[PDB]
Amino acid sequence: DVYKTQPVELFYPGYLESRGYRIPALETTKKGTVLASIDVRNNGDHDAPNNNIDVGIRRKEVNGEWEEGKVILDYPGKSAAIDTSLMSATIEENGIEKERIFLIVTHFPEGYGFPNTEGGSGYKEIDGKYYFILKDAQNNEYTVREDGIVYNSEGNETDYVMKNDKTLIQNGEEVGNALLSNSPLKAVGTAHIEMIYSDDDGNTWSEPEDLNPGLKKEWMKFFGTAPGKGIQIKNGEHKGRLVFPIYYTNQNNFQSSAVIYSDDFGETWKLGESPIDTASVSSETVSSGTQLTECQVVEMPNGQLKLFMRNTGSYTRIATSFDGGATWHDEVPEDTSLREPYCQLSVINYSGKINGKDAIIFSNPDASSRVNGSVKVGLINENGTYDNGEPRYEFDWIYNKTVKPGSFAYSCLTELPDGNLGLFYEGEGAGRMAYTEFDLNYLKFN
Ligand SMILES: [Ca+2]
Ligand SMILES: [Ca+2]
Numbered sequence: 079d080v081y082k083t084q085p086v087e088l089f090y091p092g093y094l095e096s097r098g099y100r101i102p103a104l105e106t107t108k109k110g111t112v113l114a115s116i117d118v119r120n121n122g123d124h125d126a127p128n129n130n131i132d133v134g135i136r137r138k139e140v141n142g143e144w145e146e147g148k149v150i151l152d153y154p155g156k157s158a159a160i161d162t163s164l165m166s167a168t169i170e171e172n173g174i175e176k177e178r179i180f181l182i183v184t185h186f187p188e189g190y191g192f193p194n195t196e197g198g199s200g201y202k203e204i205d206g207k208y209y210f211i212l213k214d215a216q217n218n219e220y221t222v223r224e225d226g227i228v229y230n231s232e233g234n235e236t237d238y239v240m241k242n243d244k245t246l247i248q249n250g251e252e253v254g255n256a257l258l259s260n261s262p263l264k265a266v267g268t269a270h271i272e273m274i275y276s277d278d279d280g281n282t283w284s285e286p287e288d289l290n291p292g293l294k295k296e297w298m299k300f301f302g303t304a305p306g307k308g309i310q311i312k313n314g315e316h317k318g319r320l321v322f323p324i325y326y327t328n329q330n331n332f333q334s335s336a337v338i339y340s341d342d343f344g345e346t347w348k349l350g351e352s353p354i355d356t357a358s359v360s361s362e363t364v365s366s367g368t369q370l371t372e373c374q375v376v377e378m379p380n381g382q383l384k385l386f387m388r389n390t391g392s393y394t395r396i397a398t399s400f401d402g403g404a405t406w407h408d409e410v411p412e413d414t415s416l417r418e419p420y421c422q423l424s425v426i427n428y429s430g431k432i433n434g435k436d437a438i439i440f441s442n443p444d445a446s447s448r449v450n451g452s453v454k455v456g457l458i459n460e461n462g463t464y465d466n467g468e469p470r471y472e473f474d475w476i477y478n479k480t481v482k483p484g485s486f487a488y489s490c491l492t493e494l495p496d497g498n499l500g501l502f503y504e505g506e507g508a509g510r511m512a513y514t515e516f517d518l519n520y521l522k523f524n
Contacts, residue, residue: 081517089511098123098509101305102502104490105164108177110140113280115162126158126191133159150283157188157257165308179276184302188259190267199294200266208291212263269301300327304372306490314381316402323373334361335373335387337403353397356408372422378471386425394418415475422488443486451486454478477521
């Protein structure tokens, strides 16, 4: 025989001056590089608000060692970038497959986070165009229009200008930053998803692009990355589509999972329905029942999508999409092999065949609390059809292996170029982020 490395800590308290670290994401690029991203939770392990949380990343190239970590996204003050998701994706450009590594994160202005998030996209739509909202101490609404020029609520121009990094300028002088809690004009205290990308195998990253405008619905309060990774669809009519799992709340503070997706390689995004959205329930107005929260997605051989969801029930809920993430079958069953103690989980597609079948790999804490981290192997079996004739895929969990007997919380899986598996996970102690590699045999023996 078995292969199983001694776990190494890629981030730990004090590293890069940060008190805390959480929320692993893990992706392998087409060059074979492993990318591990993390919340750099500088003021401690606690969620936003009141935490200067940045995006950090470590790289391990094929036949290489872990490069030291660096911060690749850093907002002013204690404005948080929290919960990352990575995605290696490709496009055919003039006969070569060009790789772009996508990363989305959730973003809050200073002072806000999940428990006190306000609602809305953060944007005002004026004649088809979306403009960043700014608020003053008296709760008046302002808009940032062309040239960054700020307009008050009468549609009139003010002496304020907001730069794209939210710096505020009044008559040539800087007067604050709209993400900061002492600024005279403030961005709406609500959740954004922001995206960066890398075209050089994860070494350098773009400036953040906000994905809220024309994507997040005004009734949504929380609207955030489901941490871990997304996937680019390989099979079917939606081949090439980028799919990032997310979740959000409504006015009732009810959490619903979903995916956002892009058919032009990141340029524009659409929101799929939640699995909560059925013929009788609407995720806009639902107020009771099982909440579906953090989630990860895998693809079936025909391009059918399977969304595995943290939820307030005892077991993992799995939803199926026949249209590439736009909607989900109204039956959302539990899988009773997958005890789910209300913790993030990871599920990935495996490139190789196992026992002559296509397979997926799953990890989460297999217990009634965040302990006993287990990695499971599921074989995809075709089994008849749904009411609408669609293929039925089901999962034979052939291996179930404890990789972390004690504490174990959020985790993320990735496949290594040689077919081995990597695992980035919380569980070795406050702010300690561990990475280990292993082969299939290790999962089978035990
Ligand atoms: Ca920062
Ligand atoms: Ca649960």
